[PDB]
Design a protein around this ligand. Sequence first.
Ligand code: HEM
Ligand code: HEM
Ligand SMILES: Nc1ccc2ccc(CCNCCc3cccc(F)c3)cc2n1
Ligand SMILES: Nc1ccc2ccc(CCNCCc3cccc(F)c3)cc2n1
Ligand SMILES: Nc1ccc2ccc(CCNCCc3cccc(F)c3)cc2n1
Ligand SMILES: Nc1ccc2ccc(CCNCCc3cccc(F)c3)cc2n1
Ligand SMILES: [Cl-]
Ligand SMILES: [Cl-]
Lengths: 362, 362
Amino acid sequence: EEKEILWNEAKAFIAACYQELGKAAEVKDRLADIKSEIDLTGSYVHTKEELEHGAKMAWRNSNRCIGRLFWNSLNVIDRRDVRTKEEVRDALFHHIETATNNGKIRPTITIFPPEEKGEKQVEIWNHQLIRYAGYESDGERIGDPASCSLTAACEELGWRGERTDFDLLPLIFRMKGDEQPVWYELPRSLVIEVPITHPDIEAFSDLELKWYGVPIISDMKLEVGGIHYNAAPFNGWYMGTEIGARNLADEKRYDKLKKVASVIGIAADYNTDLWKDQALVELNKAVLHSYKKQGVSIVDHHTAASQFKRFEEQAEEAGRKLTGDWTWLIPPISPAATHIFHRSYDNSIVKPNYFYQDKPYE
Amino acid sequence: EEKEILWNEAKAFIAACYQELGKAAEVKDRLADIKSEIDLTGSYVHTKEELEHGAKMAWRNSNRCIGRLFWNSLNVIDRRDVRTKEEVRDALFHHIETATNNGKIRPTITIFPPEEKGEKQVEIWNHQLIRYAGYESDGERIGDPASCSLTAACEELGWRGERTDFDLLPLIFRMKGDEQPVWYELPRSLVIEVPITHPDIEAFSDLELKWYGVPIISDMKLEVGGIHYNAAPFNGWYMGTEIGARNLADEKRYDKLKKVASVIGIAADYNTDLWKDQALVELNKAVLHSYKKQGVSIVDHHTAASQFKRFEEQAEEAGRKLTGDWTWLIPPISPAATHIFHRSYDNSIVKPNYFYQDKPYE
Ligand code: HEM
Ligand code: HEM
Ligand SMILES: Nc1ccc2ccc(CCNCCc3cccc(F)c3)cc2n1
Ligand SMILES: Nc1ccc2ccc(CCNCCc3cccc(F)c3)cc2n1
Ligand SMILES: Nc1ccc2ccc(CCNCCc3cccc(F)c3)cc2n1
Ligand SMILES: Nc1ccc2ccc(CCNCCc3cccc(F)c3)cc2n1
Ligand SMILES: [Cl-]
Ligand SMILES: [Cl-]
């Protein structure tokens, strides 16, 4: 019965994958092999080629992602061989180093052993591999509010943050068999951070803002042909608005707009002055400038949408249906200046894909 | 059968309307009267109270409208008595004058006789009562591109535009029985326009931009209890982004961002400079400033969203379900600075409401 769902998904993925790889003649035999592997074992194991192409398809099918033009150049690291927490740790350290690539960010995914019985082999607690802690007590807010629950769970495990606004959370994950996760402090040498300065407002550095170089999302499940890779961290480079319009701007995040308005020398008193809008534009300019100045990859939302238009065109040329989530594809600043805003998208879910899964804490 | 749809809609509207008006005891008799009016006549006629409250409900149910807090103060003009094109014309002139109110804009709707057999009594061709013409020929673009087809239809009827970028289209409508619409030039004394200047960039006036004071949407059908008022022009005041982020900004409209960038003294060469975003903010500041300076009502998108939050709260307090279209409710600049962006809305259609209908030209 679960053998059935698995087999069905397998037939559909293998057929599609092999067509795309020009290997359509090998399908029958491969499905035969898989069919008996499922009977005898309960599961099946992807070839390296299948796993690589599956991860790329999953990115291509991610409706909410504007960065999909580059789906076929995803760097896929196969870590299905790991068995120990030291190996997991070192694989995560390695992912950080190789994805960072001295600033010339490589889109990368590291794939850990998949769920067996729905039983996880490796369970990653981090939302992203590099992320700042958050604290709230006594009406005192420090750091990133979105990290409050994970921060508190880490401090239950004997970690202690310095309570700066930018404490790096340790890696935290649990191995099958263990009742508790282990945690490891990130080596600072591995983590590139970018101080935020503005191209012509010198006082902007007074805000002492920074952000980390590489977003490495580590809590989503990659699903490929019925196999559930719950631990499969991946990264791209940032689109600047993620940092300047949301992480640093949102009232429930770092909430910096009023401070930005002050350092750029504008009043923050009247809605009709559009001071929040002006502050947003200057903060977003500063973020792009700062990343570029430091030699860390980043994309602005106009260039990103132009790339996404090419992705739409490429999909059409290939005979593939395009799917998308308009509400996530439009950027949070000047959305109507992009073509995305002016068209609609079919939000159907196609697999392989990346999926949310329940947090193991909270 | 059509008598059936009508009766059903009637039962539902009358029940709801009278509950809201504290008149629940009068429903049975009123429905009885309506029931036989439908049998004998094929239709029924709203009382003035029903028509007024119905128009207000229709605004309250308009999913795409951020301005709904003020639904209950809609000024409803009952023009079901009109029979001639001179009366229609004068009613439209009157709507302009009274809605404008010397700049202190009154949200108003003028309701004309409804469809009878699905046969229109009055068919308005204008999209808005005040709107600029558009021309395209020989790769020459003049005025508002969105008005190109209506402009060409008017010029088929013997009207001729001066081919400025801001020619006012004449009122154009057709009476039942007539094969062609008639058109009437707007009296310039009735039409307030606002020149666009910037609060501190003096050269902004070099763009010679302007826009009209009052958006009076004249091509939607108001539906109330099964009765179809295809001709029922209404207006609010503008939210500034409608003008500065869309009408003046869109590449398929006045396409002014590159000219804005030049007059504000910034380069328009690199996406990463976010020059379009900065241009958008300055243009939008200029629009709000200009309207305010001239004493014409307008709302900025932050204040508008704050009002809409109060509308959500009021709906909850009243026990009414809230409906909305997130994709139209978010403003086209700094949307993530509004609460709207951070929640979802049920996009169900509730009646009474306003609906699209097919254009009578093109
Ligand atoms: C190469 C640079 C990349 C850029 C610039 C980019 C850009 C973005 C942006 C802006 C979002 C929306 C985020 C938000 O609003 O919070 C997003 C969502 C997403 N991206 Fe990409 N992305 C890139 C690479 C990748 C890669 C390599 C993958 C996976 C292999 C991926 C998968 C996704 C997924 C799954 C989401 C949706 C996450 C969710 O629903 O919470 N992206 N991307
Ligand atoms: C009082 C000031 C008002 C403001 C500031 C306001 C604001 C807006 C805005 C910004 C939109 C979106 C327009 C677009 O993106 O093109 C909108 C849509 C709409 N508004 Fe309002 N509005 C107001 C009054 C009214 C009134 C009086 C009515 C009717 C009685 C109305 C009915 C609607 C409808 C039906 C739509 C959707 C139109 C469509 O689907 O094309 N609004 N409103
Ligand atoms: N630039 C990129 C590349 C890949 C991405 C993949 C996923 C995401 C979305 C991450 N945010 C999900 C929603 C969320 C979750 C947890 C905390 C938050 F503040 C927000 C952003 C990405 N950005
Ligand atoms: N003229 C306008 C004004 C406001 C607009 C606001 C948004 C849009 C986007 C059109 N894309 C719609 C996405 C969508 C809409 C409705 C249902 C969906 F599932 C998805 C177009 C607009 N055009
Ligand atoms: N401020 C207001 C008040 C009422 C409104 C009622 C309706 C509308 C939407 C009008 N635009 C509809 C889409 C459209 C149609 C025709 C030409 C266009 F450029 C765009 C805007 C409103 N704005
Ligand atoms: N953390 C983030 C990042 C991007 C976002 C982008 C958009 C939103 C809006 C949530 N509202 C969704 C509206 C919607 C979504 C999906 C289907 C619908 F019918 C309507 C929240 C976001 N949160
Ligand atoms: Cl992020
Ligand atoms: Cl308009």
